[PDB]
Design a protein around this ligand. Structure first.
Ligand SMILES: COc1ccc(NC(=S)NCCCn2ccnc2)cc1OC
Ligand SMILES: [Co+2]
Length: 326
């Protein structure tokens, strides 16, 4: 029947005033920084020790939560400019046999750069911070996410994806970029879902691909990229305004706010692409412009904004709760 269309009608359970204060008190940026982020601030292009440590580190964090996460490693070989490589997409699902899933993702790999002044590229905003931010969300919402084990409702849950091999080895191109996402999107496209169904794939399963990238610079501006996601975008603007109005953000002005009503001139390439081209509805939370420090050794911890990321943690968590009705 018409479960693949439930997404098109799905509405949010908008939190009340005190629930917003409650969530706000929920997340801790000090914790995330130390425990979720710092370990990831290491060289971690595919096949590197970083890659494995990052992969271990992300799984370590998730495995220690109460909510019934189900980790899966999507390892595959592909050709690259540098020769055959192994890529390992990290998927993390609650209630995986549930038909529908809201999907947050980022990329955990970093871009490769040869050593300049003994400096190593650690891709802080790009996209370690999104990583940690997802991990914080997992933690900060663990109790509330737990009640999804309780099986009344819409048959919907949360999925995380930590894509590997987003970056290009050489120069960006169809063939040298999005290795993990190009691979997992194809795989999802052709895996029946739910098990033993006719016609429908796991891609019918993705209600919305929320893709975090290049977050951590101060005062980011996000365009509203896609018509078919626009209402969910407008929720983020709605959430942002509301938290500020409640003095639950720090270092925030409505002039220097985050989600802008304007759209985007060209077309940005990222992990969402092989999904969007297969008609996954996509909410692409990449800033325009990119950070100043983008793809430069200055993409480092000295150059993140504590309050910006923390603020974005609050905003994002509310969005997820509200989507899943928790
Ligand atoms: C620096 O300003 C920009 C440069 C290029 C683009 N366009 C595209 S298609 N970017 C693809 C990004 C891939 N990626 C994601 C993370 N690390 C790499 C836009 C920019 O500013 C809006
Ligand atoms: Co990059």
């Amino acid at each position: 029947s018409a479960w693949p269309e439930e997404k098109n009608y799905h509405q949010p359970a908008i939190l009340n005033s005190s629930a917003l204060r409650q969530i706000a008190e929920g997340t801790s940026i000090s914790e995330m920084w130390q425990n979720d982020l710092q370990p990831l601030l290491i060289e971690r292009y595919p096949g590197s020790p970083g890659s494995y440590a990052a992969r271990q580190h992300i799984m370590q964090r998730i495995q220690r939560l109460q909510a019934d996460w189900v980790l899966e490693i999507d390892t595959f070989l592909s050709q690259t400019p540098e020769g055959e490589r192994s890529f390992s997409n990290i998927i993390s699902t609650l209630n995986p046999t549930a038909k529908r899933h809201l999907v947050l993702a980022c990329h955990y790999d970093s871009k490769y750069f040869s050593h300049w002044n003994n400096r190593v590229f650690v891709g802080a905003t790009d996209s370690a911070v999104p990583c940690a931010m997802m991990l914080e969300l997992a933690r900060a919402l663990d109790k509330k996410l737990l009640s999804l084990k309780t099986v009344s409702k819409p048959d919907l849950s949360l999925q995380l994806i930590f894509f590997d091999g987003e970056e290009a080895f050489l120069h960006w191109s169809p063939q040298d970029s999005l290795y993990g996402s190009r691979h997992l999107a194809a795989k999802m496209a052709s895996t029946p879902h739910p098990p033993g169904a006719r016609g429908t794939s796991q891609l019918h399963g993705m209600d919305l691909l929320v893709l975090l990238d290049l977050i951590g610079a101060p005062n980011p501006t996000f365009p509203n990229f896609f018509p078919n996601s626009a209402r969910w975008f407008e929720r983020l603007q709605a959430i942002e305004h509301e938290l500020h109005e409640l003095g639950l953000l720090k270092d925030h002005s409505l002039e220097g706010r985050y989600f802008q009503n304007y759209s985007y001139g060209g077309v940005i390439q990222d992990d969402h692409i092989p999904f969007l081209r297969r008609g996954v509805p996509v909410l692409h939370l990449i800033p325009s412009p990119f950070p100043e420090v983008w793809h430069t050794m200055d993409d480092n911890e000295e150059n993140l904004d504590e309050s910006t990321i923390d603020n974005l943690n609050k905003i994002l968590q509310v969005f997820v709760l509200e989507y899943l009705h928790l």
